[PDB]
């Protein structure tokens, strides 16, 4: 009931190559609070029973709406079918879900580092919006494969106390290369580093900032139930390999390189 609702599509349009931005309105928005949680979306096709986990990009309490940015596959995929929904359509949503990014213990003194990659960038927007209030120092490094898949630049740049840096693998925009390059360029002592993106990018980030305790890493995984019962989304606890961490319930965001909740 509070974790499931037939939300209403306010709007939906493609904002990048095969990347759609959907705006959903519903009572579930009220239960949102921490950035990094996700929604488990049911595909409007009876032959596709598994829900699609999609990070919440941002939300508007007063408006009672949340926004998501997702990449679609071909005509045989679930996201493709979701991208067809127009304003007024209903979407079966389960959420908000998971442990999001910690922001409470953040102060206008410490300097925050935010690194995003590809479709892992969306959740970082709400995080940024959140941190903006603390008036802390924010440096956002965003990476993309190409210019046609770059997203949220406008949203990020238009945030005070935020220094945005963008890179593309083929250098079709911003700096040439992967975010990893822009990362080595920064000069300052980071207090907390929030990250979300491709696996190779997370490994690179958590590798450069190994000694950093306030390292928040958002993970992805194949899911089924989305609530912690089936154990499909497991990871080994770097702290205890025997202990299994569930991306959907324990995560998606965790502490430590090889991962620690």
């Amino acid at each position: 009931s509070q974790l499931q609702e037939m939300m209403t599509v306010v709007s939906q349009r493609e904002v990048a190559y095969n990347i759609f931005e959907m705006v959903l309105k519903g009572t579930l928005v009220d239960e949102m609070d921490l950035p990094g949680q996700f929604l488990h979306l049911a595909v409007p096709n009876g032959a596709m029973l598994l829900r699609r986990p999609i990070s919440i990009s941002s939300w508007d309490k007063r408006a009672k709406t949340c926004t998501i940015l997702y990449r679609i596959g071909d005509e045989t995929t679930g996201t493709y079918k979701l991208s067809k929904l127009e304003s007024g359509a209903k979407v079966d949503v389960m959420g908000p879900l998971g442990n999001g990014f910690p922001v409470a213990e953040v102060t206008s003194t410490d300097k925050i580092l935010i690194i995003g990659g590809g479709i892992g960038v969306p959740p970082l927007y709400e995080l940024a919006k959140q941190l903006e209030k603390t008036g802390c120092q924010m440096t956002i490094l965003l990476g993309f494969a190409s210019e046609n898949v770059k997203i949220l630049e406008n949203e990020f740049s238009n945030l005070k106390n935020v220094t945005l840096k963008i890179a593309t693998d083929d250098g079709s925009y911003g700096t040439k290369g992967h975010v990893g390059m822009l990362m080595n360029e920064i000069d300052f002592e980071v207090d907390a580093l929030y990250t979300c993106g491709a696996p190779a990018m997370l490994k690179a980030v958590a590798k450069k900032y190994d000694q950093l305790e306030r390292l928040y890493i958002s993970m992805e995984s194949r899911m089924a139930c989305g609530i912690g019962a089936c154990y499909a989304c497991v990871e080994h606890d770097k702290e205890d390999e025997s202990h299994a961490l569930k991306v959907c319930e324990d995560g998606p965001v965790f502490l430590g390189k090889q991962l620690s909740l």
Binding site: L49, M223, A224, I227, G228, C230, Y231, A244
Partner: protein, 311 residues
């Protein structure tokens, strides 16, 4: 908390207020779904498989979607008998003392099953055991216990001798002929049967050309397999004199009634929980009106009618 006699069914060790039971591996130990609704609404619960020692399971990806179904190669991940005996089952007994629990048991050899069966019955809330015999038998080259009548029978006999609650045996659908295995399991002492466990499937990633599942193969479940379950249930129903709890692609009240037409006495719901967290209570709520439509006075009556009008 209003009960309904039309829905209650009595099976060995199981006095169910209604026939709906979440299937093993699809409800964990009830701790996650308990957040969505009151578990007492359920008839019972088949908790995930328990093994002697802890099991982490198979590497990931562990799941994949299929047309009207899904593949899973979880690998029977669980904390082990000890933790289940001291933490998981007690949680259920503390919060839902009146809810009977069906304990799913797995293992790599007969010795493992025996150990779990003998112990798990110590839990006050565990009212029956469901043997997951789709596991590879290391003592038989890796062959699943459920694909050999004689091997399955010996396993059931040994387990029956040490169990303190009625013993149910979950049959595998991955066999040429299910009748021999069912007859042998019944002859060996099984108090009841549950069926079916998953079929075997594989999905390939077109970009990598590799299997989607790390384990390559996975168990196929969901509505896609319901016709196979109904076929096997109906087939076994004609040759056994012990009850059958049916499962495989049940997603609504109509499917539950179809399970009964095939010969089932109770109905488990697995995969459907992932799509709709409230599927079980919705089904329970819907059953009475559906029964009214199809002239069914009660499920107990239906079970008897189907049993005598074999057709």
């Amino acid at each position: 908390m209003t009960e309904n006699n039309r829905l209650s069914v009595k099976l060995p060790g199981l006095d169910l207020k209604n026939p709906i039971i979440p299937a093993s591996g699809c409800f964990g130990f009830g701790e996650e779904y308990a957040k969505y609704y009151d578990l007492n609404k359920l008839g019972s619960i088949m908790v995930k498989a328990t093994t002697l020692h802890p099991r982490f399971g198979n590497p990931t990806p562990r799941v994949a979607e299929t047309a009207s179904g899904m593949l899973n190669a979880i690998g029977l991940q669980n904390p082990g008998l000890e933790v289940i005996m001291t933490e998981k089952l007690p949680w259920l007994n503390e919060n839902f003392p009146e809810l009977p629990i069906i304990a799913n048991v797995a293992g790599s050899e007969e010795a493992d099953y025996v150990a779990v069966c003998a112990k798990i019955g110590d839990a006050a809330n565990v009212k029956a055991i469901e043997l997951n015999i789709s596991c590879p038998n290391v003592k038989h080259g890796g062959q699943a216990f459920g694909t050999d009548p004689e091997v399955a029978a010996a396993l059931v006999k040994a387990c029956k001798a040490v169990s303190k609650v009625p013993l149910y045996v979950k049959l595998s659908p991955n066999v040429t002929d299910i009748v021999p295995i069912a007859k042998a399991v019944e002859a060996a002492g099984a108090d009841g049967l549950t069926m079916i466990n998953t079929l075997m499937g594989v999905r390939f990633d077109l970009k990598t050309r590799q299997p989607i599942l790390a384990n390559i193969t996975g168990g196929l479940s969901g509505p896609a397999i319901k016709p196979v379950a109904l076929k096997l249930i109906h087939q076994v129903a004609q040759d056994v004199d012990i009850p059958i709890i049916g499962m495989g692609g049940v997603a609504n009240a109509q499917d539950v009634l179809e399970m009964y037409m095939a010969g089932a006495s109770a109905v488990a719901v697995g995969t459907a929980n992932f799509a709709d967290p409230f599927v079980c209570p919705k089904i329970i709520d819907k059953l009475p009106e559906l029964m009214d439509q199809y002239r069914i006075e009660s499920l107990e009556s239906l079970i008897q009618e189907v049993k005598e009008g074999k057709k």
